[PDB]
Write a protein that binds this ligand. Sequence first.
Ligand SMILES: [Zn+2]
Ligand SMILES: [Zn+2]
Ligand SMILES: [Zn+2]
Lengths: 148, 107
Amino acid sequence: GVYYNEISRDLDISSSTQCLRFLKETVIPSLANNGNNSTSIQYHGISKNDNIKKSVNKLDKQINMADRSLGLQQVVCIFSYGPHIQKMLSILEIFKKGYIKNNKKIYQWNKLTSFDIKQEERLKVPILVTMVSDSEIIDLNLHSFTKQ
Amino acid sequence: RVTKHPSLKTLTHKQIHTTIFVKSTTPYVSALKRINKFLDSVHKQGSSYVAVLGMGKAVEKTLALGCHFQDQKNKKIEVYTKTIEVLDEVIQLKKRAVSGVELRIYV
RNA sequence: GGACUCAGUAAUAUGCUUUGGAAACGAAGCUUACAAAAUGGAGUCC
Ligand SMILES: [Zn+2]
Ligand SMILES: [Zn+2]
Ligand SMILES: [Zn+2]
């Protein structure tokens, strides 16, 4: 079966539906607490089957979704794993392309972690978690991440 | 379609000895061995990290390597998302964009 | 908004190919990043 953070988990790698939910409900919180700070997190899991056009559209909506009156910083969490990371990268990179052309600025934070699927085999199935915002300083506790 | 040119790489002499490029064809352990050798040799070159680059088909495997060094070999790694311009001919040279990853592994 | 199909060379997870040796054990190599899935891939079902 599948292992995360050295711990066995009830997961089927072949199911993106199942694995993306686990990422959202377990992995992302394991890295970022939205409770103690002024951030508004929008989640966006990506599979290899996702349409680029429709997904960039969604991210454009998600990035401009939080209330402008309450002084909330709009943060979108784009995340994927293994065979699905490719399509994520495309969606992510095109989205930023369509953002900087208005002479606006995007800021991103990336974290890499993995699933361990299992003489004993031990294969690394990678996990990419990207945070995007129009605010340069985010109140989230993302020290382990990579600024870009 | 007729032929596809590789990416332009504006690298200096010192970068050439600190950067690895992962191919779709590259086997896993072959890539491990090569990164290891670069980690030991980067001391002489005078850089903190070994840059590991991959795009398209190779993305997953490139990142899987970054997972090995980060976890099983306790290395501090930065991860960047990249866009790469690539020229094709189908006659006329046309531009095409492919997405990839820069993976810096610190010594 | 949900659930999916489509790329057969990571064909080989400290391995693998070629190579030397009876064997012990050696040798060479497997980086100059992509899959018409980035003109914002192509389709299906609810
Ligand atoms: Zn050329
Ligand atoms: Zn040189
Ligand atoms: Zn030299």
